[PDB]
């Protein structure tokens, strides 16, 4: 009833993909482009 907006609220961000799972007491604030999996895509958009 507050944070929800019509058409989606893009102000909140979350990291969906990463190379490896983080350990406890470990965080990632980096918004830089990283590889989304084990596919040799070099992080660039495309190639799944």
């Amino acid at each position: 009833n507050l944070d929800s907006k019509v058409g989606g609220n893009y102000n909140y961000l979350y990291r969906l993909f990463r190379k490896s799972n983080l350990k406890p007491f470990e965080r990632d604030i980096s918004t830089e482009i990283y590889q989304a999996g084990s596919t040799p895509c070099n992080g660039v958009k495309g190639f799944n």
Binding site: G37, S38, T39, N48
Partner: protein
């Protein structure tokens, strides 16, 4: 690589079992115009049964 394929309505369903599936050759062969998967990454298929 077969000569002829079935029609879009006539499409044949081939059952594949009891063998090894190597998808690293088809990905690096550059024999496809486009390659896309749904819900599962292609390189993970090598570690999945």
């Amino acid at each position: 690589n077969a000569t002829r394929f079935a029609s879009v309505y006539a499409w044949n369903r081939k059952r594949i079992s009891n063998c090894v599936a190597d998808y690293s050759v088809l990905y690096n062969s550059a024999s496809f115009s486009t390659f896309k998967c749904y819900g599962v990454s292609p390189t993970k298929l090598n570690d999945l049964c």
